Amino acid sequence: LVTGNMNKKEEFLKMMDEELNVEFVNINLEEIQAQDIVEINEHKVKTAYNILKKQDNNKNKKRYVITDDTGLFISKLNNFPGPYIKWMQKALGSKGIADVVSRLDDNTCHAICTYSVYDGKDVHSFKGITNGKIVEPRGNNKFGWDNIFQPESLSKTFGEMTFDEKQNLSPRFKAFVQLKEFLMNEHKKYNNEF
Amino acid sequence: MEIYLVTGNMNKKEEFLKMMDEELNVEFVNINLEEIQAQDIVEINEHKVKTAYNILKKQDNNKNKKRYVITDDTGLFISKLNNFPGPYIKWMQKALGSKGIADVVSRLDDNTCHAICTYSVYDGKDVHSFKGITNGKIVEPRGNNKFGWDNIFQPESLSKTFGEMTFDEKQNLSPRFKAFVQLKEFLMNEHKKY
């Protein structure tokens, strides 16, 4: 039980990592309001760790628990909604967000994904940022706001990509890669000490 | 009986006292409270008052028969943002300010919205919440500007924003006054039992 990750909607970590084994737990986490996405996610990961601690596996050795969170920061909303994108997406949907942005002076934005890992004592966070533009929906529409996000100077949306091109621009991948190197440096450190 | 409104805002304190008109003795306590993320503002405020109650109760080393703790929370619900930001208004306000929100709303098909004030009271066993709701329009800032987004909320059919209006003009109109008179009736009812 050395590495625990939490979601029910997500099979990205599967394909993103192969050098380590990982477990997937589903907990119903209460998020808090704050200004910094990292603050929200570190609180969430500590909260989840504690729930995993008091329930069942209360007796064991070092355990790593991981949560993620994504924000969408829209330039002409002065970087709103950030970590509240999921309430905006619930209210407006991809089409509604794109129609709002088509009424602003420009459509530039950026998406941030953060991983946070907690071992009972230490918290670590890794964020990936990808600049882009809100555009009218294109591509798959079951992946949230992927269909309206057009990264960098490209002509596609995330909803129009699969995994070859998406990964390289995915803020989640940029973040994950930092998280993997930390986990592997902890696993390597563990093994040298035996 | 013992009633506590949670606030550190001196202006909010005096407005409450004046609403109460010496009908009930109300004490104030300045406690920072975390706001969870949730769909409904009442769910947010109810969690917040239950938290405020427990912080006060553990501190006091007391247990009273009846002790009433009250928190409030407000939201701005913009019609052409499909009622977003709602309870997240203050993160929009911090990002964009009053001028920025008015500017954004003026780019949508209309500037209609509604504002909601909520009071939640908790005695340790039962939680009760009260929702005051008022329709309006988002306009260029007008009046006092140190009261959050009052200066851009123009209650429906009127030509003044809340920032230009007096206490008497808000009676039966301000979402806070509507919620307060419900709360006060509940507290008065609880007082007959004492």
UniProtKB/Swiss-Prot annotation, chain A:
Question: Subcellular location, in the record's words?
Answer: Cytoplasm
Enzyme class, spelled out: hydrolase
Cofactor: binding details: Binds 1 divalent metal cation per subunit; can use either Mg(2+) or Mn(2+).
GO BP, sorted A to Z: deoxyribonucleoside triphosphate catabolic process; nucleoside triphosphate catabolic process; nucleotide metabolic process
Give UniProt keywords alphabetically: Cytoplasm, Hydrolase, Magnesium, Manganese, Metal-binding, Nucleotide metabolism, Nucleotide-binding
What the entry lists under SUPFAM superfamilies is as follows:
ITPase-like
Q: Name one GO cellular component term.
A: cytoplasm
EC number of the protein? 3.6.1.66
Record bears the keyword Manganese: yes
Cofactor requirement: Mg(2+); Mn(2+)
Q: Pfam families per the record?
A: Ham1p_like
Q: Which reaction does it catalyse?
A: ITP + H2O = IMP + diphosphate + H(+); dITP + H2O = dIMP + diphosphate + H(+); XTP + H2O = XMP + diphosphate + H(+)
| One Gene Ontology MF term | XTP diphosphatase activity
Q: Where does ITP bind?
A: 3-8, 44, 69-70, 86, 143-146, 166, 171-172
Q: Does the keyword Zinc apply?
A: no
Binding positions (Mg(2+)): 31
> Any idea what job this protein has?
Pyrophosphatase that hydrolyzes non-canonical purine nucleotides such as inosine triphosphate (ITP), deoxyinosine triphosphate (dITP) or xanthosine 5'-triphosphate (XTP) to their respective monophosphate derivatives. The enzyme does not distinguish between the deoxy- and ribose forms. Probably excludes non-canonical purines from RNA and DNA precursor pools, thus preventing their incorporation into RNA and DNA and avoiding chromosomal lesions.
What do we know about how this protein assembles, alone or with others?
Homodimer.
Q: Which PANTHER family match?
A: INOSINE TRIPHOSPHATE PYROPHOSPHATASE (PTHR11067:SF9), INOSINE TRIPHOSPHATE PYROPHOSPHATASE/HAM1 PROTEIN (PTHR11067)
What does the sequence similarity comment in the record state about its family?
Belongs to the HAM1 NTPase family.
Specify the protein name.
Inosine triphosphate pyrophosphatase
